[PDB]
Amino acid sequence: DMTNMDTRTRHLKVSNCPNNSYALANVAAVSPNDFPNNIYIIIDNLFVFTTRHSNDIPPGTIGFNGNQRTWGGWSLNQDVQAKAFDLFKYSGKQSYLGSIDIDISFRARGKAVSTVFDQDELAKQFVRCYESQIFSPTQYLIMEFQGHFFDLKIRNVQAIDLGDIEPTSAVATGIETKGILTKQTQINFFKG
Amino acid sequence: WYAQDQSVALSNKCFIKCADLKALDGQYIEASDIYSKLIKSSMGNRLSQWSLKDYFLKKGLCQLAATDAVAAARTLQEGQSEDPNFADSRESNFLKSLIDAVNEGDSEQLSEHCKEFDNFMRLDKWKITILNKIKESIQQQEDDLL
Amino acid sequence: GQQIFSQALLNANRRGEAKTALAEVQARHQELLKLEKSMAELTQ
Amino acid sequence: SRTAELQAEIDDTVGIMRD
Numbered sequence: 001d002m003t004n005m006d007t008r009t010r011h012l013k014v015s016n017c018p019n020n021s022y023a024l025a026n027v028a029a030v031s032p033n034d035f036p037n038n039i040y041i042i043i044d045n046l047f048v049f050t051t052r053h054s055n056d057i058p059p060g061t062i063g064f065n066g067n068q069r070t071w072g073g074w075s076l077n078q079d080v081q082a083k084a085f086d087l088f089k090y091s092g093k094q095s096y097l098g099s100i101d102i103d104i105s106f107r108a109r110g111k112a113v114s115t116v117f118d119q120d121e122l123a124k125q126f127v128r129c130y131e132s133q134i135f136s137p138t139q140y141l142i143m144e145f146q147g148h149f150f151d152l153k154i155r156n157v158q159a160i161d162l163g164d165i166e167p168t169s170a171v172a173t174g175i176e177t178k179g180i181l182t183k184q185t186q187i188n189f190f191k192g
Numbered sequence: 193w194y195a196q197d198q199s200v201a202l203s204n205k206c207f208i209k210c211a212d213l214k215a216l217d218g219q220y221i222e223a224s225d226i227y228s229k230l231i232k233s234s235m236g237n238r239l240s241q242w243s244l245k246d247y248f249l250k251k252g253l254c255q256l257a258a259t260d261a262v263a264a265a266r267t268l269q270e271g272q273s274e275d276p277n278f279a280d281s282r283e284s285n286f287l288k289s290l291i292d293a294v295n296e297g298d299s300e301q302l303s304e305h306c307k308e309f310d311n312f313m314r315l316d317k318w319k320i321t322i323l324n325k326i327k328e329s330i331q332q333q334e335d336d337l338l
Numbered sequence: 339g340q341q342i343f344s345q346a347l348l349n350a351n352r353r354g355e356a357k358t359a360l361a362e363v364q365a366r367h368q369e370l371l372k373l374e375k376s377m378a379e380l381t382q
Numbered sequence: 383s384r385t386a387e388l389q390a391e392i393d394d395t396v397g398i399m400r401d
Contacts, residue, residue: 312378373389373392
């Protein structure tokens with residue numbers, strides 16, 4: 001429930017991720033005193049992430065992993081602006097993800113494996129680990145699939161409103177479009 | 193007690209043993225302080241010049257084992273300014289190289305410099321132990337940043 | 339009524355002596371480094 | 383041959399000094 005929440009801006013320092021599990025979660029780990037739990041927060045009016053309570057991060061600091069810093073071009077100890085986010089107000093109607101294209105690459109070139117990756121399994125893992133989160137084009141993410149680490153870049157996103165039988169909306173490559181993941185989004189995987 | 197008799201040489205022998213054992217026991221700062229005393233008691237004496245270089249090196253090494261690279265740099269500068277024989281010495285260059293490696297967080301470069309110094313001047317057991325500790329600290333910081 | 343050019347060729351002369359002016363410096367150099375190392379120990 | 387000779391003498395002198 002996002003109806004009521006403090007929208008005041010906060011300046012937060014970027015730091016090393018607390019550990020690998022939090023980076024695998026791709027949720028901004030914040031203290032209880034910073035922001036409520038399980039709410040979407042925007043950073044620099046561009047980068048949207050889901051908050052999760054974390055006692056290992058003191059109030060006034062925001063945790064990021066390597067891919068997010070690559071996306072934002074941030075260094076360690078950099079100050080970033082953080083505010084509340086409301087995608088439903090911003091988009092109006094197109095609040096869901098219709099079709100999402102993901103380029104898949106090996107994080108380590110020496111970890112190339114000739115195993116057959118099932119795209120349905122990748123999509124199922126994407127939905128299972130990540131539900132009701134906001135994603136934008138060029139957003140980067142790290143997947144641990146059967147012990148294999150992969151870098152995923154959402155090359156393009158399509159935003160559709162509930163009740164639209166056909167996806168007549170144009171697929172947008174611009175970072176403005178954002179949506180909410182659902183269990184029916186068509187996930188297309190391309191080589192990196 | 194030897195310093196009480198003005199027996200500088202015997203006092204220095206005892207303080208060398210004390211500082212070596214303190215540094216091996218993890219008391220790096222106190223060993224660095226005893227090496228400061230040894231250095232000061234050996235300045236200007238032509239006879240201890242060769243021990244003097246060694247003292248400067250060891251002091252820096254303890255300061256690197258305490259992760260205080262700034263103090264190691266200050267020790268290097270002090271030795272370069274106060275003792276000309278230390279300025280050109282292999283020990284000063286080695287300490288500089290170790291400080292540079294520590295500031296860069298590159299454990300492999302530290303190991304390379306250790307091998308290079310070993311080839312020209314054998315690292316005794318004490319130096320090997322302290323250098324291994326310094327490498328361990330660099331590697332631990334590297335792991336903490338990933 | 340015509341005119342001529344000329345050319346150069348480098349002759350074993352350099353095939354040897356110039357390559358030797360690398361090998362024979364670095365290698366005698368190796369002897370001198372050995373001398374220096376021994377003198378360092380002796381001085382200590 | 384001169385310098386080897388020199389090296390040989392220095393090595394001998396190192397031995398005497400170790401003694």
